[PDB]
């Protein structure tokens, strides 16, 4: 059909994808054991996109979980939906990276990548017509930020035409937990820009802000963060999995969302988030969804788009609606906030409609935006990387792995060319 293989890297990736798989199992009516339990026939029509068939009316996720540290695999297996994953797909090493991108990328990742490649090649030859791969990982880690990039670089060579999505977790400078984090981020953004079709930058600080303000949760743990990420990933492909008035998919979004191959960083958003008190005084309406989304507080990246130009905007709605109101709202937000949009692309908003709402909810909307505000993260990462790399601090850890010193310089050059190019496109009048 149109299948997706879910690549999983790091503790971030493993927990996030566990939440994501559990969530989409709730959408397709899949039990912890594996069988089907749903009521409607549409709930089981296109489940082969993510699931593979096994005897007994059983479905296994199309997931490949990779980690250099074995202790996360036990927690994943003992999680709520720990049964559902076939344990051949689990690929683990014996020694981790120790938050070292170089160790994840050169030294120890080379011994696990053959096995991971064999697993993903088996899974790719399983499905007849694969749309592409979708990877979750963290940029501040050692395996996802590290070995994940090597995996990407090999599979881009292996299957060039297939789509390549990454729900990447970029580090936050305001709240950080790793000292050597900027080195890994700088060394992995280069691989991201070279070999990736689309990226979604997800910020844990932004998720914390959303939980603190929008939902007012007293104690939002990492589970609610992964819940929000899973909302985003489900809302990306809900229209692929379920029919709607105006259909779309990953390539429908990517072709319309990437004007130039160097520009594939996106800011995702999810509309229906209200507190328990705010549930009392509200109205489920398309204008309210549009406003709640277009507020910058709802944003789950770490940049304010009011400081950028929206290159292009994507709105994918979930649930049955009237298209008059959604087209009226998108045209209105285009006209009213006129100069936040670039002038060299007309009708910057692309819309999609899926009839089936998410389970237990009448209405929802998701969003993917390419804007100029995303370079604000790269500038700050570059600033901290310069401040660290001037003094050759923490450099022996990376140097003992056998790599030279020109790689930092070339990664910095690529990142600076990226930010210069984005700013040049921002400051670009068209003459006609």
């Amino acid at each position: 059909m149109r299948e997706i293989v879910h690549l999983q890297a790091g503790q971030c990736g493993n927990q996030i994808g566990a939440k994501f798989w559990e969530v989409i199992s709730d959408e397709h009516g899949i039990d912890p054991t594996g069988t089907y339990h749903g009521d409607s026939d549409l709930q089981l029509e296109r489940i082969n996109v993510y699931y593979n068939e096994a005897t007994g009316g059983k479905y296994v996720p199309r997931a490949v979980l990779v980690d250099l540290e074995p202790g996360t695999m036990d927690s994943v297996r003992s999680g709520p939906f720990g049964q559902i994953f076939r344990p051949d797909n689990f690929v683990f090493g014996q020694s981790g990276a120790g938050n070292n991108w170089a160790k994840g990328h050169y030294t120890e990742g080379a011994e696990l990548v053959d096995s991971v490649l064999d697993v993903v090649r088996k899974e790719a030859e399983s499905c007849d017509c694969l749309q592409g791969f979708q990877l979750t990982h963290s940029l501040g880690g050692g395996t996802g930020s590290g070995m994940g990039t090597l995996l990407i670089s090999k599979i881009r060579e292996e299957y060039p035409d297939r789509i390549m999505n990454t729900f990447s977790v970029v580090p936050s400078p305001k709240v950080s937990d790793t000292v050597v984090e900027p080195y890994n981020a700088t060394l992995s953004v280069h691989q991201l820009v070279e070999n990736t079709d689309e990226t979604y930058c997800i910020d844990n600080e932004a998720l914390y802000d959303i939980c603190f303000r929008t939902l007012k949760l007293t104690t939002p743990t990492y589970g609610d963060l992964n819940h929000l990420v899973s909302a985003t990933m489900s809302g990306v492909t809900t229209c692929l999995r379920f029919p709607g008035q105006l259909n779309a998919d990953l390539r429908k979004l990517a072709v319309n969302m990437v004007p130039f191959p160097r520009l594939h960083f996106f800011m995702p958003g999810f509309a229906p988030l209200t507190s328990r008190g705010s549930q009392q005084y509200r109205a489920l309406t398309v204008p309210e969804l549009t406003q709640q989304m277009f507020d910058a507080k709802n944003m789950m990246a770490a940049c304010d788009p009011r400081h950028g130009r929206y290159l292009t905007v994507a709105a994918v709605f979930r649930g049955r609606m009237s298209m008059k109101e959604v087209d009226e709202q998108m045209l209105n937000v285009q006209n009213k906030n006129s100069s936040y949009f670039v002038e060299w692309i007309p009708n910057n908003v692309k819309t999609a409609v899926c009839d089936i709402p998410p389970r237990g909810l009448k209405m929802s909307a998701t969003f993917i935006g390419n804007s100029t505000a995303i370079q604000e993260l790269f500038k700050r990462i570059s600033e901290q990387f310069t401040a660290m790399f001037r003094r050759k601090a923490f450099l022996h850890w990376y140097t003992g792995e056998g790599m030279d010193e020109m790689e930092f310089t070339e990664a910095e050059s690529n990142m600076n060319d990226l930010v210069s190019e984005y700013q040049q496109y921002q400051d670009a009048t068209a003459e006609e």
Binding site: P70, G71, M73, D74, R77, S78, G82, Q83, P87, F92
Partner: peptide
């Protein structure tokens, strides 16, 4: 309590129960 039944490979392991047999 750190349960390493799943992480332990088939060599160098005892007959301790893994999850979901």
């Amino acid at each position: 309590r750190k349960n390493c039944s799943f992480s332990t490979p088939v060599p160098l392991s005892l007959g301790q129960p893994l999850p979901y047999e």
